[PDB]
Amino acid sequence: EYPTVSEIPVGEVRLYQIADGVWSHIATQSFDGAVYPSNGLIVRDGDELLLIDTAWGAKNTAALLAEIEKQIGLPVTRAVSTHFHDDRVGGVDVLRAAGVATYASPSTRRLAEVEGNEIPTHSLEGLSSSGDAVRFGPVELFYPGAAHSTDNLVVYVPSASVLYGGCAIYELSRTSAGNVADADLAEWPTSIERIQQHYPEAQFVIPGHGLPGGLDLLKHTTNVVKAHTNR
Numbered sequence: 077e078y079p080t081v082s083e084i085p086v087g088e089v090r091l092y093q094i095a096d097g098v099w100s101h102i103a104t105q106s107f108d109g110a111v112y113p114s115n116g117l118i119v120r121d122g123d124e125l126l127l128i129d130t131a132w133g134a135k136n137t138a139a140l141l142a143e144i145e146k147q148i149g150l151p152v153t154r155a156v157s158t159h160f161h162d163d164r165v166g167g168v169d170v171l172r173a174a175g176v177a178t179y180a181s182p183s184t185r186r187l188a189e190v191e192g193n194e195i196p197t198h199s200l201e202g203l204s205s206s207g208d209a210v211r212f213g214p215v216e217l218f219y220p221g222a223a224h225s226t227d228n229l230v231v232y233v234p235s236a237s238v239l240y241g242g243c244a245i246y247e248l249s250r251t252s253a254g255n256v257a258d259a260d261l262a263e264w265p266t267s268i269e270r271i272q273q274h275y276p277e278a279q280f281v282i283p284g285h286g287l288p289g290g291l292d293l294l295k296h297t298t299n300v301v302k303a304h305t306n307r
């Protein structure tokens with residue numbers, strides 16, 4: 077039922093409805109000789125939509141906007157990028173040209189600039205210290221501490237008990253650490269503990285890549301990170 081990597085051609089974007097007014101968006105990209113899936117989120121905010129993360133590149137993000145218009149038919153008015161990598165900000169310029177207001181923490185905007193990646197326009201305040209949470213429209217944004225990257229945010233949809241972990245959370249089928257070049261391996265398990273403590277009621281946990289599950293994905297990610305640490 078959830079679209080798997082093997083079922084989405086590069087260039088196309090699938091929407092998967094999780095709850096009333098909550099969808100995930102799924103895209104793919106070929107990278108370094110393999111094909112990877114990538115998740116983001118769409119949350120209804122009255123008669124508008126909040127987007128979480130691009131669809132990993134300009135072409136996919138243009139397709140994402142077309143697919144949202146076709147399937148949902150409400151305007152995407154704001155988008156938040158949850159860290160500075162290309163699977164989260166790549167496509168920000170597309171969103172901006174289409175009139176979407178793009179947002180990220182000041183730490184994400186800085187790291188994207190250093191990396192030469194696309195830079196969301198607006199700066200989200202109130203997320204600079206581990207454990208910080210702010211409401212943004214229909215979601216809560218939470219900075220759990222450094223993990224997959226120094227700047228990674230997670231997103232919670234209280235009306236639906238959906239926790240979007242982004243790339244700080246691994247799918248169960250991923251048993252080796254991924255891209256950890258920008259990670260804080262030492263802090264990542266403690267950051268995951270903060271997520272668990274703040275969102276114990278979550279019913280649907282979405283990783284940045286791959287299949288959703290429950291809160292077990294948090295301990296799974298800790299296990300994989302610790303294994304990599306001891307490599």
Ligand SMILES: CCOC(=O)[C@]1(CS)N[C@H](C(=O)O)C(C)(C)S1
Nearest residue numbers: 107112161162163243254255285
């Ligand atoms: C575009 C370069 O790549 C990325 O933007 C990510 C960011 S998390 N890196 C991952 C990796 O290198 O494994 C990935 C799953 C391919 S997506």
Ligand SMILES: [Zn+2]
Nearest residue numbers: 159161224243
């Ligand atoms: Zn990343």
Ligand SMILES: [Zn+2]
Nearest residue numbers: 161163243284
């Ligand atoms: Zn990623």
Ligand SMILES: [Zn+2]
Nearest residue numbers: 248295296299
């Ligand atoms: Zn596991």
